[PDB]
Amino acid sequence: GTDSSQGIPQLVSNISACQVIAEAVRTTLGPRGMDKLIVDGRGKATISNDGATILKLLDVVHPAAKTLVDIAKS
Amino acid sequence: ADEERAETARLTSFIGAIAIGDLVKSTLGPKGMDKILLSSGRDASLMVTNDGATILKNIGVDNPAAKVLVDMSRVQDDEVGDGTTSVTVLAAELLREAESLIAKKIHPQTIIAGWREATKAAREALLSSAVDHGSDEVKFRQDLMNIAGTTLSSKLLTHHKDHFTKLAVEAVLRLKGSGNLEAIHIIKKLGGSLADSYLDEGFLLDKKIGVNQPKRIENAKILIANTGMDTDKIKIFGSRVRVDSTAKVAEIEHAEKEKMKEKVERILKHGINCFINRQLIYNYPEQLFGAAGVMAIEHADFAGVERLALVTGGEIASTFDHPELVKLGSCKLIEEVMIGEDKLIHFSGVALGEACTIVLRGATQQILDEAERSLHDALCVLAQTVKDSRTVYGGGCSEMLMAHAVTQLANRTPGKEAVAMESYAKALRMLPTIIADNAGYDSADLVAQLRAAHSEGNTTAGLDMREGTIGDMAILGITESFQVKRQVLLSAAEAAEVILRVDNIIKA
Amino acid sequence: KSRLMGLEALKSHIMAAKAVANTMRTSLGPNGLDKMMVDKDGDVTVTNDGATILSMMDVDHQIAKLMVELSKSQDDEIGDGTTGVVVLAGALLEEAEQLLDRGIHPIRIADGYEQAARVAIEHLDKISDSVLVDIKDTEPLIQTAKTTLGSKVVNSCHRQMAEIAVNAVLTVADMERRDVDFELIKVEGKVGGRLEDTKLIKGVIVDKDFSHPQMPKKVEDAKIAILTCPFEPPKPKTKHKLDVTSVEDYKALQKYEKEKFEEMIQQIKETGANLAICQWGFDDEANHLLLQNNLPAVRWVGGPEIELIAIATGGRIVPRFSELTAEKLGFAGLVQEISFGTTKDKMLVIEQCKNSRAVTIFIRGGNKMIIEEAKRSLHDALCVIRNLIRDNRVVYGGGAAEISCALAVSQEADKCPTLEQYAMRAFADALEVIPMALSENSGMNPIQTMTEVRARQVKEMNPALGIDCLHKGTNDMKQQHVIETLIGKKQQISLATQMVRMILKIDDIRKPGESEE
Amino acid sequence: NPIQTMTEVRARQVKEMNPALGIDCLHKGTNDMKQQHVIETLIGKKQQISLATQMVRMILKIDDIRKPGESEE
Amino acid sequence: QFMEETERSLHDAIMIVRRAIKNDSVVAGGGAIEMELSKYLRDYSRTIPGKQQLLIGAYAKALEIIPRQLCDN
Amino acid sequence: RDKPAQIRFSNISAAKAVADAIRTSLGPKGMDKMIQDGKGDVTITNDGATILKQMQVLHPAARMLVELSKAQDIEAGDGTTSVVIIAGSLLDSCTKLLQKGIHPTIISESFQKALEKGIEILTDMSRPVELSDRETLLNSATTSLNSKVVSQYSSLLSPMSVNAVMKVIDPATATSVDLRDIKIVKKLGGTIDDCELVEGLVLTQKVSNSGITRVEKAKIGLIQFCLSAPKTDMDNQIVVSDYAQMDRVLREERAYILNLVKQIKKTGCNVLLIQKSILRDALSDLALHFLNKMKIMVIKDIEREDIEFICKTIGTKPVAHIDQFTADMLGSAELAEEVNLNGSGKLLKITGCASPGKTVTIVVRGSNKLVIEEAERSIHDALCVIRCLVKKRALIAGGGAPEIELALRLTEYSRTLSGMESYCVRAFADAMEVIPSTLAENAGLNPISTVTELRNRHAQGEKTAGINVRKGGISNILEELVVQPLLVSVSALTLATETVRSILKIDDVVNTR
């Protein structure tokens, strides 16, 4: 079949989808700006302080997470 | 994968060697309850085993802790002899000692040193009550007898031990400076005798010699050869590939009878009537090998020719080319002597001398093997009797006495490690405990009284625990080389202490 | 998979890197306790060697892999120190815990440990910085090749293991170049030898011996015929490989290679090289000819080895039987098979007194782990020795520097007003595991044992005297000849603090769980 | 060890008869009832004898093991 | 494990040194302008609103969170 | 560990447990047992002797008894239930005294001196008869042919049971009369009155068809060779792609062999026993056609029994291929006799052959194996009974009845031993008198009257008498026509002795893996 959802439950989930992701890069980016060891595969363990790389590395399960990648990657 | 921590690494260390250490325990010291090996996993069998090394590999040794003593005890019996049963129990006795110290949380360093410290001091103490019974060669022959007396003990043999005592004695006597283990040749077979161990003239050999070929030979001078055939000769012509049809699968087998006949001629170039091709032949070959006048006698033993390569002044080598390459073996009469319904071609006219072949006729191959290690150990330990006439008194009469000073030492000698050294001087006396109660005696009045009876200097006084008593070691003749006592500790000494200090086990 | 951050990812990082240190700190030092380690392969490995533990260790928690790395770095250059940097990590790791538990920020904590490590490695410089030549170094080398080979279980009764190392880095690499060649030093070992069997070979020992000793077992200086040519089937890459079953082709072939191999062997005798090393070596049929030719020559050779026979001997390369010329002759000082008194051990030493470009330090022993024990003995001995033969800069060990380092750091921590004033002082705290575990390895109560050294360093203010590293009763470091390359502690420290620091800098974990590979 | 210890005067019982000697009651290293001087009124032992089987003889008395709902009540 | 962090300085600098080349117009780094802007913007939260002082206030403050994070991380 | 504790019981348990339900024995007791296995397969079982051999037992000390079951067969052939039933009796004494804390080695020690005491008192109550005296050979076998399969036929077998022995028996008292001694061979066909004592070495064998030798002066063959022929032992010059070539290879085969089969006969052979194995097919069956046409008995892939006896009693050796002729090492034969009675069975009768002074042959005949085994099982024990009289003379009663005489007499010596074992020696001296009571076991209700009456009245037979368990009622059991040779039960003691003693020797933990 086909799935769809509207309005605040979706719309809050629309903004709920996003706010989860921005915390990946949250404390990152700097000298005391943190650094991310992100292991997205069993023997595949990746380290970046940049979002775009881990954005490329991480899975995007949301249109938000999808719509976010380029924005930061921009 | 896996990282194991000390507690299990120590406890599994404790349990396995202890679990295996008590397999032969009641069979150790003198004879208590025996040890039945039930084999239910790999087969269905009722088996009786007092041997650690037997018991070791039979039950699963795959416990890495068990592997240690299984290895260490095996190595020890394989070196000094009858050490497996010891070492398997000894470090098992040891593991219980530190296990309290471990429970007391005594520094792993502490127990290591103190035991190994006391390990010296006891073998040191073992060095004193070690007494030369072999000063005089006849007393040494008597030393060889009592030392072999404690070796052949505790196993299952009906009349067999009597042949091996003198023989482990005689293997030394005629050889001048070592015992004969290899000059002695082991033949383990089922003959017309339910119990026999005897001396083999040359070495007997099994086969049915039928058909045309004369079944006896006289004035044998053997041409010693390792080269030959079975159904196909090794030569330029030894291979033919032809099958184009179903008749050929039948025809291909007939041309096999072409390959046997051409070598029957080749033994005739040397003209040698006594020629060992050490590879087998059948009656139809015996039909063919009886025509020429140069016979190929099949399945000649390697060590039996070595047996001959010793006394005859001949040679044991590989392959063969012409009679002068490998020196001609010579035996007065090669004969076929029937034991039961089966006949045995017997290489004879050569009796003992520099070497011995020993044919054991038992009721079972089982009774044949338990005498070998008995012999094998009594051979080696009587080779220990050679250099060291010292026999230190058996029945653990050394153990308690080894434990005597170390006890008295541990108080004095360490101002700390007495924990280990006493524990050392403790575990030494476990072997007497497991037997003396199995004896019906009260070990508590054994390991310590009789200790301070012999350890304060009546050393002949020792365990006759097959009477359930104190017993006189020299009088019982139950004693064995001082060299059989030390290393069985030294193996077992480290058998324990390895897994003691093992604090982790990584697993792939 | 999941994002793990902060105290979550902290206690993620904390487990194994702390937990792994425990078996290694119980393995710390010679009094360090062995560990039987058994594979799923049925294998059994008894290891007090953390570098071997880490190798043996396949365990999870990627950090627990990163130590398998980090020991190997210090393993080659410094030699010893593989295990300590690991057990020091978990020290300053748990040490880092309660500062965050205090509320000291994850990047506050690491740097306080980090700059305080500068003082440490700086304070380390105060112990002994000496520099000497090889022939002087051997004394501080063997006194350390006591410890190294000995902390590797039986230096005992060996300066044979000790002083061939004095030659090893020496011959392959200069003193001052300090370019690490343990790659040029050939550490070779053979079971069936003895630990009392150890040998320096400045050239290459090739295990393959003369086809027959009936042929001369001594080839003269050089005149080695470099041959990549089949005298047995050269696993030739082109064709379908089939032997013949018929007597017809059985005779047709046997006359064929009797012609070529002989005239090959004679062509070798023609090239003027009375040893023929053959990268595709000798079967017996060529060897009868070779014997019939009375030409000393070498049977099957490893492919790169005949090349290693070139470089290590300075040997000029004759590539192939097609390139043959009498001018190019491989170098061998003397070509002979070597039985050491161990006859089961037979190699053919190509022994270069002229051009030696690979120095074979050849050690022996009764069995596998034995020689391995002796190899990693001979390995890290020389590796510690390589520092000291280059710059012989010695700190005396067993926590004698730790207090010494922990002292200066501690006050200077307080002197720094920065938040890390705690962390830098918290830094000086976890240094004490080094005598601690060693104390308990040596079987002593550390908390007292260590402040002995403190009371020592309160007085001494230098590693000289110390506690027992060898559990010998003389509490000493200098005098106990506990002698550690002053480079290595600086190495070892910087390795611990900075690896952890990135572990501390990485608080952001995308994993399905706390740890992962 | 009783069976052991019992085995001893047993041998005596085969060796000797009705030992005025015996096994140590005092746990003396020596075993008599003489050296132990353990001797009881040849009444009392038989007086004691009278008691034992009587009890078993008592427990059997009648066929009634039934209870109204009263047995020990 | 210390080496990675070093050259990223080398790699970053070039990128932003080149970035300093590419656009020569350059301001203070490290979010210096945001607070000003955060002020400057919700200054309109005084100036803008019939409504959206909220929006202008909420717009103004979100600037600061990046370096505030850098402050807080 | 408590395992040696728990298992030694579990050892004794499943040993004794299975062995306890195993006592229905000696008479129409209980009700028939139809066994359908743990795999669900129907068997109908009865008459525990077979059942003892049928016995399929989990647990090892239970498996110990199947052995122990078979142990009595070749030792005696009588009282196999005995050694099986009394197996629990030793197992009894174990636990009770193990409970008592008696060291099981003492209990293990308790077995021999008992076994030393016990079998002696059986010999002390034993009833002397002879090994060569046809009447004493008859009577023991008679009672052992009375309740065994055939009796009317045993009237023929009892003397042959005896007549076989006087050959086999070596002069007067001699260790003699083994199962290898009397040669027991089934013969297809006839009946039991066709079962006859056929003296010397008589080789039962499958000889191809007839036209064979029934004629005197065989050279009895042992032949490891092929007749060397096209498609037999000799190269075929003809390859077959063709029906003219394929018809050619068998013709050259069959036309050739006809010479060797006569040459096979030319040794004088009325027998050549083929090698049991194949050289290719070994001897072609097209060959074996013409071997028998020259009157030479052939069993291709000969059974094991002939090969040995002919190498043993007759003493025959292999001989050269008849292209080489033979070595005349064909054993002594004056006849190859192949008899069909009922018209059934093919045989080799060798008389005029080497014989040890033993190897009498009995040729056991019947319209089926039933009639055959009817004679066979009966005569065999009757031999084995006489065999026991040979191996150990005198007599004891049948069915453990004398063991109660022992129990009384022994318990005293058990008692008067007054040792650590004496207790055990007393405990097991009392574990005998159970056996007649415990065979009574399975049949019925209002039950228990006779149990101790199966005991007491014997104990009140003085030490000389008790109920006859075979025939019924009290007499002097030892000769009532309730009898077995003295040898029979003294083995049952010994046999069960160390088996149970081995259980006391079970310690720690054993499963070989």
Coordinates of N, CA and C in Angstrom, one line a residue, chain B residues 31 34 48-50 152 154-158 160 366-367 370-371:
Chain B
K31 N 47.2 -49.2 46.4 CA 45.9 -49.5 45.7 C 44.8 -49.2 46.7
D34 N 39.9 -48.8 42.7 CA 40.5 -48.6 41.4 C 39.8 -47.5 40.6
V48 N 38.8 -50.3 32.4 CA 39.4 -50.1 33.7 C 40.8 -49.4 33.4
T49 N 41.0 -48.2 33.9 CA 42.2 -47.5 33.7 C 42.7 -46.8 35.0
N50 N 43.9 -47.2 35.4 CA 44.6 -46.6 36.5 C 45.6 -45.5 36.0
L152 N 56.1 -51.4 38.7 CA 55.2 -52.3 38.1 C 53.9 -52.4 39.0
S154 N 50.4 -51.4 41.3 CA 49.2 -50.6 41.2 C 48.4 -50.7 39.9
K155 N 49.0 -51.3 38.9 CA 48.3 -51.5 37.6 C 47.7 -52.9 37.6
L156 N 47.2 -53.3 36.5 CA 46.5 -54.6 36.4 C 47.4 -55.5 35.5
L157 N 48.1 -56.4 36.1 CA 48.9 -57.5 35.4 C 48.8 -58.7 36.2
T158 N 48.6 -59.9 35.5 CA 48.4 -61.1 36.3 C 49.7 -61.7 36.7
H160 N 52.4 -61.0 34.6 CA 53.3 -60.4 33.7 C 54.5 -59.7 34.4
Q366 N 44.7 -55.5 25.7 CA 44.6 -54.6 26.9 C 45.7 -55.0 27.9
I367 N 45.8 -56.3 28.3 CA 46.8 -56.7 29.3 C 48.2 -56.5 28.7
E370 N 49.3 -52.4 29.3 CA 49.6 -51.9 30.7 C 50.9 -52.4 31.2
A371 N 51.4 -53.5 30.7 CA 52.7 -54.0 31.1 C 53.8 -53.2 30.4

